[PDB]
Structures are given as C-alpha cells and as structure tokens.
C-alpha cells in the first residue's frame, strides 16, 4: 500500500506557533517541498521525511499530525480505484478516483468519502478497480497521528 504521486491530500502547516495555512496539494508536490525544508532518512529503498508542524485531513474530517512521509520504487502494480457517491440537491452523482499500489478491498464495498463542496464525509461505493500495470515512478506513503491510520487520498479514505 502506497499511493500515486498525483494523489491529492489536504495539508495544514503551522509556523511560529500562531500562523497556519491549508491547501489541497498533490503528494509528490508535498514530498518535493518538504525535501527542501527537511531532509531524507534512508532504509533499504525508502526515502523518509519527518516533518514538523504539518497536518493532514483524516477520518472524522479533522486534521492530525503528519508524522512521516516516504517514497520508494515498487514492483507492485498500480491499481486505480473509482468510488461513487451521490447527494440530493435532483440527484447529484459524484465519483472520485485514487491510484494505489497493493498486493492485497472490493468492487461493491463501501468506503468513506470526503465531499469537499459540502465539507462533510459521506459513504461511497467502490465502483471499479483497474490494474494499471507496473510502474517505474516513485510511490508515496504517509504516517498519520490517528488510530484510524488512514487519510483522505483524492477524497477517498485510504490506509
């Protein structure tokens, strides 16, 4: 389990105790940015950043600390997951998509989805899963300060 670099995440950063900024940013962009600010630890093939004063939106539509972030090359296939939701406004149908790696979730399962326009969490259904094949690109991982161990990845809750 990692996510593709174009995965979107909701990030808050804090400075000087008193100032905070929040934005929706791609995870590769977040990584490259933090790479200038902090610096990478290394394991067998992981490059890891332990940022301070960063937070990420997770289950419960709340921001918790982003404790670490990493990237690595992977042998695993990229898998595109499409998730549908809807609300009555008269039906507004929505879908979101996230590309993850995994060696391991099922079409038909329900998953939590962040409805950004109404700033609330809704139930989504996995509508499709597609094997996109192997990749040469880096894939990314977050550790989040929440016992859900999950964060919203392009509006879809992922672990």
Numbering used by the authors: -1, 1 to 15, 15A, 15B, 15C, 16 to 85, 95 to 109, 128 to 182
Give me lines lifted from the publication on this model.
Here, we report the novel and atypically split PolB16 OarG intein and its biochemical and structural characterization. The PolB16 intein carries an atypical split position close to the N-terminal end of the encoded split intein domain to give IntN and IntC fragments of 15 and 168 aa, respectively. Most notably, both residues at the 1 and +1 positions are serine. Furthermore, the intein overall exhibits the typical conserved motifs of a class 1 intein29 that represent conserved residues across inteins, of which some are involved in catalyzing the steps of the protein splicing pathway. This analysis suggested the PolB16 intein splices through linear and branched oxoester intermediates.
To this end, we genetically fused the IntN and IntC precursors, each with 10 extein residues, with a 3 amino acid linker (GSH). Ser1 and Asn183 at the splice junctions were mutated to alanine to block all splicing activity. We obtained protein crystals in this format for both the wild-type sequence and the cysteine-less double mutant (C111A, C165A) and could solve these at resolutions of 1.85 and 2.6 Å, respectively. Both structures were virtually identical (0.185 Å RMSD, root mean square deviation), consistent with the negligible functional impact of mutating the non-conserved cysteine residues. No sufficient electron density was found for a part within this region, D86-S95, suggesting it is mobile or less structured, as well as for the termini represented by extein residues (except Asp-1) and the ultimate N183A. The last well-resolved amino acids, Asp108 and His109, show a conformation of the polypeptide chain that departs from the canonical intein structure. Trying to explain the unusual functional and structural detachment of motif N3:10 residue His109 from the splicing pathway and the intein's active site, we noted in the crystal structures that His68 is positioned in the vicinity of the upstream splice junction.
